[PDB]
Design a protein around this ligand. Structure first.
Ligand SMILES: Cc1c(O)nc(CC(=O)O)c(C)c1O
Ligand SMILES: Cc1c(O)nc(CC(=O)O)c(C)c1O
Lengths: 157, 155
């Protein structure tokens, strides 16, 4: 049915009557996150994985697994985090894919992104460059994931 | 040149000794935005153009121009904002491109992005779905641009 809602949105864009996001779109996204039972985290360090896993378990009742392959094979692309997400989508079966990496060019800070079964971007969050930041990574990852969930109306509480 | 710094970064990644962003990279980004001489705003829109312009004229001493053509056609792609940025990049020349649109799928909130001459993503910022923050486009675009500049050390 997501295909249907997005189709409605696209029809609205075609007819030049679209004004931003619709409530049914957002609730479809939230329902998609909350009702997810399989989640893949596309990084090899387990710290990251634990943070993300335990956060996501309070939002959904999913099996959350990690990725055996390492994704440095994305640190040469234009948007590394997204590329990691797409690699994970290509080699692993899930209803949600969670990725974290560099936003764009070297120096651009960090991005965490959540993709669905067909590679659509559901939500994302950013952190300043670790260069200026100088704060811990687990707390920063927690901040990223919580903002990414909250900005689409999902409470970790 | 940015080509060299990025090449070194890529080399570190190849030899698997890369640890993250380095200060000469960030300094190259700041260097890139502050010393811009031309900035293109990827919109036909009044509100947006003036909003972005007012910040950017106070951060740099560039000619800041708008787009004769409008980029609503990007609202059917996977990441509309980036696509808008690439359209602007594709049809007119500048040292900076500022684009603003939907992050991803319908319902996913908004993204503002800043691109260099070669379409590289220098910085970006995100907003919750307009469904949730019921603020309209000019308050949060300013918040987005200011956040995007601040996150890379630009005041
Ligand atoms: C067309 C369009 C859309 O469908 N969604 C958004 C994000 C939002 O409404 O929060 C934007 C900015 C937009 O330009
Ligand atoms: C390889 C790599 C990089 O060059 N930059 C960043 C962003 C940062 O340093 O905050 C990340 C996360 C990263 O994995």
């Amino acid at each position: 049915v997501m295909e249907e809602i997005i189709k409605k949105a696209f029809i609205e864009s075609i007819n030049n009557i679209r004004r931003g996001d619709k409530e049914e779109e957002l609730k479809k996204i939230q329902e998609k996150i909350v009702n997810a039972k399989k989640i893949v985290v596309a990084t090899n360090n387990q710290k990251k994985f634990k943070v993300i896993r335990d956060i996501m378990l309070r939002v959904c009742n999913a099996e959350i697994k990690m990725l055996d392959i390492d994704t440095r094979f994305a640190d040469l692309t234009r948007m590394p985090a997204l590329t990691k997400g797409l690699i994970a989508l290509d080699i692993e079966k899930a209803d949600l894919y969670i990725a974290r990496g560099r936003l764009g060019a070297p120096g651009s800070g960090s991005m965490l992104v959540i993709l669905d079964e067909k590679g659509r971007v559901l939500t994302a969050s950013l952190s300043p460059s670790s260069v200026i930041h100088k704060e811990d990574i687990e707390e920063r990852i927690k901040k990223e994931l919580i903002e990414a969930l909250s900005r689409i109306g999902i409470s970790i509480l």
